[PDB]
RNA sequence: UUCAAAUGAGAACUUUGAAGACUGAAGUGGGGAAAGGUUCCACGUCAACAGCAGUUGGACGUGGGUUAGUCGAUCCUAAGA
């Protein structure tokens, strides 16, 4: 996840099973005010679903990654 | 510590909902933070506070 | 007493009338036992080159007369057995016959 | 089979989450009866039959 | 040549450090004290510009003769309960305020870097040159100035228990420097502690510092260090990196404990003496018998003293680590901060899975083996001209550097630098507290220093985890500020200076760089009795010279 | 042969004479598992005696 | 099947190297369908098992990993229900 974040500027989150692509897009936009180029999801065998979010060239995931708290 | 209903119930809808949203953001940040260490006793107070706020809103 | 005395070995002496499947292992065992009897040690090591030479003709076609040399070496420290130690090494010759045991001076 | 239905995959996920030995700190309580969990299962021996 | 080279390098490092410290002191005085030029700035930016200035002044020395130079210790500008190593970063002000929004009663200014008056700020610094290091530390106190007189000298002397503790630290430093100086050919010690037949070991210094602490009614935090320094090893790693051949004396809570004939109850309770072997640590374990001072080497003297506020009875002062997760508890004076100093253990060799991680790992490999800050790495670090485009480029690089550092921490290729807070616990709680086991064997921290080298409490067999748990499970828990200072000592020879006898050079010391704040009070090494040895020692250190003494001090240098 | 006189001085690097032998490895290898992740067995009990 | 080296308290069997071999492309390979369901892989570890030993594992303990407007279901219908 960290390697992809550094390379492709793609964030990765863990989402509830109920949500879908549109819900993820609306949530990220309304909570971070960031433009999302692409969104994808994948339910891991553990039981929850994670998601990959590709932003625009106008934004860098490093800023939000440092600001949220996890490094 | 935490929040108690007998003094929490003395507010209107707007500010109480705003406080609920702020503490939801706080709990989301705490959930992000708890990835590293396995034990964090502070989240119990957060859960009880959010439950109390939601219940008083409903009532 | 580090010595080096190139001997000669014929396989036909000790490989006669043995199973085709184990010709090479029998050759290996006979070679190590021959070194043991003609040196008087406890630890014997073979050479990868000698293994190549013995297997090279075939698994069931080992050549009879092979030339080998035996070197005594002092064992390293913390060796509870003894300083005695034998190491074998092959050497090819134009003709199998016409050669006998020869001690070679250290150089 | 890479074609399981969502409920089947959920069942398998719950089985995988369940598949673990006992946490060590359990034995440190007072008046304990748990010795080793008998619900542990492995694919080689037991088959859950969905 | 060796003596000349050593003296030149040490003098260069010491003068550079003194110049940096005087510059920082003048800068902070101009910003806050003296003239209120409304140019008030916080701690991180001052630390960064100080580091850049030090790097610029270091770039002009040995740039070609050798290929090894650096800043041994980052310029820590710390406040109050901080033990040391606290270096905030400019980008982390928002993060720290967000973390500390839960409670910022007595430390809001401390975390925001805008010190309130009377904060007892401390500056520590360290510079490395070709494997040799020199360190420096002192303190300053600021409070509102008079406006009637433009000279801006506020009421002269200042009052306070913390100020008295700082004065105790100053006089202790003076005494230890004097006794260390009286270790050369002038064998005649200026005291009844020897002078004709004595090896000058650590016992005398222990007695002297204990007497000074008792006289000033201020405790000593167990962080002191009187250690000879060989190249590449100076104790700057505290206890993270194992030191073996060290011949020095350190202060621990296990020390200074009540003796078998201390005329105190101490609740002995016939507790069995700990015959269990100490954990295998490659240390000499305070060889308190052999401390004969010999020439040809260098030494570091670092004294930190903990003040004693209103406490009902005597207790114990120790150090508590600080986390950065806010998930522990809530207190009126709980501090949350992320340490910024990190070191790499070259013993472990491993590769990681990030291009940025690889790049920064190789860069820090090129960098010397000493504690460093993330901001210490910058292709634009020297700051030729002051502006904000360079600052923002530095931050945009620091983001990726922080990510790679987090990757390094996630793998096992670094060690966090602990941040300690001096906290006091009465002996009664420890004496009457539960002791389930005589050992800890935690084996779950990062690495190394599991029992703190020597056991934290060989007497009574108390472990570190239990000690800290008991400490946080208290009711008074009075916090004690620490006054810290340090300096370097170099011995000399007739060959070193044929002009005079073998002398002693004090590096990062002297009044010209360690003038204390105007402080006057009482309860200061009371006269009469047998305590007069210290007063006699100070008078003799003042009057030793017939017409010139064998002690010299370095001096700073102008900017241009 | 003398051309190889380039890495001859490179064996010396300094830096505590290459960190002063292998001492951090012994303490760092004591952990049952590596990396920074939550262990449901190790993290359950803090005290080493327990 | 053979020898050497290394690890390792301890090597006919663990790893590598040096040889000999066989499967001989309707294979002991490369993919998959039913089924199997975390066994894939990484790290520390071998009392229990791999009828023999195991320093090794499809074993033990902790974790990582499956990204679909174009691939299949979801759309339609047969014998049927």
Q: Per the CB < 8 Å rule, is E406 touching A2?
A: yes
Question: Could you tell me if E96 and E495 are in contact, meaning their C-beta atoms sit under 8 angstroms apart?
Answer: no
Helices (H) and strands (E) in chain B, counts: 3, 0
Q: Which residue in chain D is spatially nearest to F40 when comparing CA positions?
A: D23
Nearest to E423 by CA among E331, E486, E341, E342: E331
Identify all chain D residues contacting A46, using CB atoms and an 8 Å cutoff. 13, 16-17
Helix (H) or strand (E) holding A15: strand A10-15
**R_g (Cα) of chain E, nearest Å:** 24
**R_g (Cα) of chain D, nearest Å:** 15
Half-sphere exposure of B14 (CA within 13 A, CB side): 0
Q: Which residue in chain D is spatially nearest to F49 when comparing CA positions?
A: D28
Question: Could you tell me if B41 and F46 are in contact, meaning their C-beta atoms sit under 8 angstroms apart?
Answer: no
Q: Per the CB < 8 Å rule, is A45 touching D10?
A: no
Token pair, residue E183, equals 């270790």
DSSP state for residue E375 in the 8-state scheme = G
Which nucleotide is nearest, taking the CA of residue C60 and each C1'?
G20
Question: Which residues make Cβ contacts (< 8 Å) with residue D11, sequence separation at least 6?
Answer: D50
| End-to-end Cα distance, chain A | 11
Measure in Å the smallest separation between the Cα of E417 and chain A Cα atoms.
17
Token pair, residue A12, equals 């990765």
Nearest to E245 by CA among E303, E304, E200, E290: E290
CA distances from E159 to E41, E117, E154, E194, E521 (A): 26, 14, 12, 37, 7
Q: Find residues 79-138 of chain E whose CB sits inside 8 Å of chain A.
A: 91, 94-95
Token pair, residue A25, equals 């897009």
Whether chain A lies against chain E with 3 or more Cβ pairs closer than 8 A is: yes
Q: Is E531 exposed, middle or buried (0-12, 13-18, 19+ CB in 10 A)?
A: middle
Identify all chain E residues contacting A67, using CB atoms and an 8 Å cutoff. 94-95
CA distances from E267 to E75, E264, E428, E493 (A): 44, 8, 9, 52
Token pair, residue E121, equals 């700020």
CA distance E48 to E34: 23
Token pair, residue E105, equals 């009663």
Half-sphere exposure of B15 (CA within 13 A, CB side): 5
CA distance E481 to E122: 11
Residues in chain A: 71
- Chains D, F: CB contacts under 8 A, how many? 11
Q: Per the CB < 8 Å rule, is E327 touching B37?
A: yes
Q: Which residue in chain D is spatially nearest to A44 when comparing CA positions?
A: D13
Whether chain A lies against chain D with 3 or more Cβ pairs closer than 8 A is: yes
DSSP state for residue E107 in the 8-state scheme = T
CA distance E117 to E21: 20
- Chains A, D: CB contacts under 8 A, how many? 12
Q: Which residue in chain B is spatially nearest to F37 when comparing CA positions?
A: B36
Q: Is E59 exposed, middle or buried (0-12, 13-18, 19+ CB in 10 A)?
A: exposed
Question: Could you tell me if E76 and E124 are in contact, meaning their C-beta atoms sit under 8 angstroms apart?
Answer: yes
CA distance C4 to E476: 85
Question: Could you tell me if C48 and C6 are in contact, meaning their C-beta atoms sit under 8 angstroms apart?
Answer: no
By three-state DSSP, how is residue E27 classified? helix
Identify all chain F residues contacting E346, using CB atoms and an 8 Å cutoff. 15, 18-19
Question: Could you tell me if E194 and E200 are in contact, meaning their C-beta atoms sit under 8 angstroms apart?
Answer: yes
State whether residue E6 sits within 8 Å of chain F by CB: no
Helices (H) and strands (E) in chain D, counts: 1, 0
Question: Which residues make Cβ contacts (< 8 Å) with residue A21, sequence separation at least 6?
Answer: A39, A40, A41
DSSP state for residue E329 in the 8-state scheme = -
* Per-residue three-class SS string for E172-225: HHHHHHHHHHCCCCCCCCCCCCCCCCCCCCHHHHHHHHHHHHHHHCCECCCCCE
DSSP state for residue E92 in the 8-state scheme = G
Helix, strand, coil proportions of chain D in percent (round to 5)?
35, 0, 65
Determination approach: cryo-EM
By three-state DSSP, how is residue E133 classified? strand
CA distance E255 to E253: 5
By three-state DSSP, how is residue E506 classified? strand
Token pair, residue E107, equals 């430390």
By three-state DSSP, how is residue E553 classified? strand
Question: Could you tell me if E236 and E72 are in contact, meaning their C-beta atoms sit under 8 angstroms apart?
Answer: yes
Burial code (b: 16+ CB inside 10 Å, e: under 16) for C9-31 equals bebeeebeeeeeeebbebbbebb
CA distance E236 to E486: 12
Strand order in the sheet with A36-43: A10-15, A49-55, A36-43
Give the other-Cβ count within 10 Å of E126's Cβ: 25
φ and ψ of E218, to 5 deg? -130, 135
Resolution in A: 3.8
Report CA(D3)–C1'(G33) in Å, whole number: 11
What phi-psi label fits residue C25: left (phi over 0), alpha (psi between -120 and 50 degrees) or beta? alpha
- Rounded to the nearest 10 degrees, what angle do helices E389-410 and A61-68 cross at? 60
Q: In strand G, which positions have an atom below 7 A from any protein CB?
A: 1-5, 17-21, 32-39, 43-44, 58-68
């Amino acid at each position: 996840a960290m390697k992809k974040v550094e390379d492709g500027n793609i964030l990765v989150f863990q989402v509830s099973m109920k949500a879908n692509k549109y819900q993820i897009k609306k949530a990220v936009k309304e909570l971070y005010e960031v433009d999302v180029l692409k969104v994808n999801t994948l339910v891991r065998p553990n039981g929850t679903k994670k998601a990959y979010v590709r932003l625009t060239a106008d934004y860098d995931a490093l800023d939000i990654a440092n600001r949220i708290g996890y490094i | 510590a935490g929040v108690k209903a007998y003094e929490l119930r003395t507010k209107s809808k707007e500010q109480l909902a705003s406080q609920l949203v702020d503490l939801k953001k706080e709990l989301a940040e705490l959930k992000v933070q708890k990835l590293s260490r396995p034990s964090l006793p502070k989240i119990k107070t957060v859960r009880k506070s959010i439950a109390c706020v939601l219940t008083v809103i409903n009532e | 007493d580090v010595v080096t005395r190139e001997y000669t070995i014929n396989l036909h002496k000790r490989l006669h009338g043995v199973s085709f499947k184990k010709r090479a292992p029998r050759a290996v065992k006979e070679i190590k036992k021959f070194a043991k009897l003609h040196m008087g040690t406890d630890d014997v090591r073979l050479a990868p080159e000698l293994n190549q030479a013995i297997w090279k003709r075939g698994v069931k076609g080992v050549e009879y007369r092979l030339r080998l040399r035996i070197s005594r070496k002092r064992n390293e420290e913390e060796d509870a057995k003894n300083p005695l130690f034998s190491y074998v090494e092959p050497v090819l010759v134009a003709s199998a016959k016409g050669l006998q045991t020869v001690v070679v001076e250290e150089d | 089979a890479a074609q399981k239905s969502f409920r089947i995959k959920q069942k398998m996920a719950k089985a995988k989450k369940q598949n673990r030995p006992l946490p060590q700190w359990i034995r440190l309580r007072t008046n304990n009866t748990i010795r080793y969990n008998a619900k542990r299962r492995n694919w080689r021996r037991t088959k859950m039959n969905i | 040549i060796l003596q000349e080279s050593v003296l030149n390098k040490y003098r260069t490092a010491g003068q550079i450090a003194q110049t940096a410290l005087k510059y920082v002191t003048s800068l902070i005085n101009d910003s806050y004290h003296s003239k209120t030029t409304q140019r008030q700035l916080t701690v991180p930016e001052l630390c960064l510009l100080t580091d850049s200035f030090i790097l610029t002044r270091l770039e002009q020395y040995y740039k070609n003769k050798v290929n090894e130079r650096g800043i041994a210790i980052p310029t820590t500008i710390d406040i109050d309960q901080i033990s040391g190593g606290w270096c905030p970063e400019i980008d982390d002000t928002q993060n720290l305020l967000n973390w500390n929004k839960g409670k910022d009663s007595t430390f809001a200014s401390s975390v925001t870097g805008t010190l309130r008056p009377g904060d007892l700020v401390k500056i520590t610094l360290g510079v490395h040159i070709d494997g040799y290091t020199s360190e420096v530390s002192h303190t300053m106190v600021i409070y509102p100035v008079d406006e009637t007189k433009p000279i801006l000298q506020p009421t002269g002397p200042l009052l306070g228990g913390k100020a008295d503790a700082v004065a105790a630290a100053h006089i202790a430093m003076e005494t230890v420097v004097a006794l260390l100086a009286c270790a050369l050919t002038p064998e005649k010690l200026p005291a009844s502690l020897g002078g004709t037949s004595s090896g000058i070991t650590g016992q005398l210094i222990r007695t002297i510092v204990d007497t000074i602490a008792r006289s000033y009614n201020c405790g000593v935090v167990p962080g002191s260090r009187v250690r000879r320094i060989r190249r590449f090893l100076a104790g700057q790693n505290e206890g993270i990196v194992a030191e073996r051949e060290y011949k020095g004396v350190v202060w621990t809570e296990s020390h200074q404990e009540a003796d078998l004939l201390s005329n105190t109850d101490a609740k002995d309770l016939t507790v069995v003496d700990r015959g269990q072997s100490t954990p295998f640590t490659n240390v000499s374990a305070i060889p308190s018998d052999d401390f004969v001072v010999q020439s040809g080497e260098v030494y570091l003297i670092d004294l930190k003293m903990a003040s004693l506020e209103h406490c009902t009875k005597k207790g114990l002062v120790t150090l508590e680590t600080v986390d950065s997760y806010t998930g522990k508890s809530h207190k009126a004076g709980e501090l949350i901060a992320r340490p910024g100093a990190y070191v790499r253990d070259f013993a472990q060799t491993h590769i990681l899975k990030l291009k940025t991680s690889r790049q920064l790992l190789t860069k820090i490999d090129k960098q010397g083996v000493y504690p460093f800050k993330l901001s210490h790495l910058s292709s634009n670090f020297p700051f030729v001209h002051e502006n904000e485009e360079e600052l923002q480029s530095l931050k945009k690089d620091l983001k990726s550097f922080r990510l790679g550092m987090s990757e390094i921490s996630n793998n096992y290729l670094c060690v966090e630098s602990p941040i300690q807070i001096a906290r006091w616990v009465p002996w009664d709680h420890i004496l009457k507290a539960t002791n389930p086991n005589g050992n800890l064997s935690y084996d779950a921290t990062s690495t190394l220093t599991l029992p703190g080298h020597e056991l934290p409490l060989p007497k009574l067999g108390v472990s570190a985890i239990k000690l800290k748990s008991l400490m946080n499970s208290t009711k008074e828990s009075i916090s004690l500020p620490v006054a810290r200072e340090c300096n370097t000592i170099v011995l000399c020879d007739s060959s070193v200076s044929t002009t005079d006898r073998p002398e002693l050079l004090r590096l990062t010391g002297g009044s010209k760089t360690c003038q204390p704040s105007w402080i006057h009070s009482q309860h200061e090494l009371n006269p009469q009795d047998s305590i007069v040895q210290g007063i006699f020692q100070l008078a003799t250190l003042a009057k030793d010279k017939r017409f010139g003494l064998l002690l010299k001090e370095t001096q700073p240098m102008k900017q241009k | 042969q003398n051309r190889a006189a380039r890495k001859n001085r490179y064996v010396e690097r300094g830096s505590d004479v290459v960190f002063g032998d292998q001492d951090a490895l012994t303490a760092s290898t004591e952990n049952g598992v590596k990396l920074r992740q939550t262990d449901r067995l190790l993290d359950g009990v803090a005290d080493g005696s327990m």
